[PDB]
Design an enzyme around this catalytic site. Sequence first.
Site: not given
Lengths: 302, 302
Positions: A150, A243, A273
């Site tokens: 991330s 994602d 994700h």
Amino acid sequence: PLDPRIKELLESGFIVPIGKASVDEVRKIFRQLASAAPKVEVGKVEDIKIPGSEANINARVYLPKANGPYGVLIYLHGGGFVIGDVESYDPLCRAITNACNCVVVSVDYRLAPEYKFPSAVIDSFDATNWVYNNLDKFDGKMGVAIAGDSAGGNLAAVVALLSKGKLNLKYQILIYPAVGFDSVSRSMIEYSDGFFLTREHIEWFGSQYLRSPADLLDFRFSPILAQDLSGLPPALIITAEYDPLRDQGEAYANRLLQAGVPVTSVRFNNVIHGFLSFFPLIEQGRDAISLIGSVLRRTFYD
Amino acid sequence: PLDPRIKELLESGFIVPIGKASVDEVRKIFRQLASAAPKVEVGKVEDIKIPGSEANINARVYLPKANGPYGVLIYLHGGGFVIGDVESYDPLCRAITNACNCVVVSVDYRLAPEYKFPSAVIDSFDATNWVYNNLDKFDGKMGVAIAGDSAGGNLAAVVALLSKGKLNLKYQILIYPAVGFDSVSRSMIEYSDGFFLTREHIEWFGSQYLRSPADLLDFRFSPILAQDLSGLPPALIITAEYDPLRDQGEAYANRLLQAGVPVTSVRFNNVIHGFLSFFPLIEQGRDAISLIGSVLRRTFYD
């Protein structure tokens, strides 16, 4: 399509309510979800204090059971520059440790909204720089690589850029990274809602970390805008099919490849994700951890 | 786009002339190509004879250097059901042995055009069966998995189907598998020419192996047509981005997931079909090998 196990999971309300609850409420909820993972036993785990240019930076050091000498992995956690921390990432970092037979240094970089961009970057760099100049403390003859997921993948990629001609990093691992501003990719449009990380979440995180729109164009937030990507460390980039951040991660991969950096870019199909943080519920996460470990074993130990 | 290394390599010329030369000529060329890959040193290596239902089946058995007890991997080579053999796949099988710390049994199944469909299927099944019932010869307490690439992935997938109710296999690994006939998918159309494996190659191989067009619908050539995929062993499916077979492999992953079978489907980006055979040249091959290895290690040992 989505792995059925993950559709069942989303349909039963598995969520972090980013932008619908307070900063503390979402920190607590993500802590709880990520603490559900067991902690594999490893070697000695200590907390340390790294003397940063702007702050005193907490890190947690994990050694493996294996004897040294070791390679050292700097691990920068995800959470949109706002959530996550060493404690919440402890199951994953343990699992990487035991998979890589290497020293993991999980950095508690400073979080937004209390500390704005570029504070997280400066902490992540200063920690990398310091760990690299003190390998003797860690028995790190085999050198240092960097990793994150991330936002952490963002900070990892940015650190590698900032390190060009200062530090010889062995390797960078970008796990579903954010690599810059994206209002157009197909993945951002099509998976903008309903796949755990949402466009609203991405917007909310930036509202907390960024100071002005000008920061969107700064390479320390959008590494893909960097002028020259050549001579960066070799890269493992992992991407998720469902994602919104997929297409950008793969763009960054391609751009590194175009500037002659060696990249292995792997898309994990059927998943969302953040899936490594939830490896007990999403088996593919275990496989990604395995990929990460065995790639690091090669580049540290021949 | 293609990893630049693989583009320079294809523009250089990097070809097995499947359309054009004779069967013996392309076999000899594929043999030349495949053993410019280094043979990593493992434990003991011997050739054995496996008593099949239609023939004595040659197999090579590779022990890892590590101590037992072991898991055992049945490995089924690619080559369009026409080329390849144990000798050509020796470096890959050694690489896998080393990465999996497991016994690998590489099977020299009968080949087309001399032995048509379903001869390959039968030998691969008979070999799997025999290994499964003679695990004491391999110090194989921890069970049997099956793996293969190109046609070998086809055959591994089919043997897993054929084994439901009969054999408890621990795991199947399908490396850029052919999963049936495909006149229609985007990857098949878009990557028909220029990416090493071409449509003409696929047609030609099909024409050597199958006896009539009816074989195209037989689940032992098109496992995606099987009536019930449920209860199959858990899977790792690897695909390559620039491969005409990509879309059919990912469909099989999806159709297995939809039947309740656990599947980690992973697409290696920027690479071509066959990339594991060329790991000295295509670094991503080495990372795919590590993934396979680390996944087998978790499944078997623990």
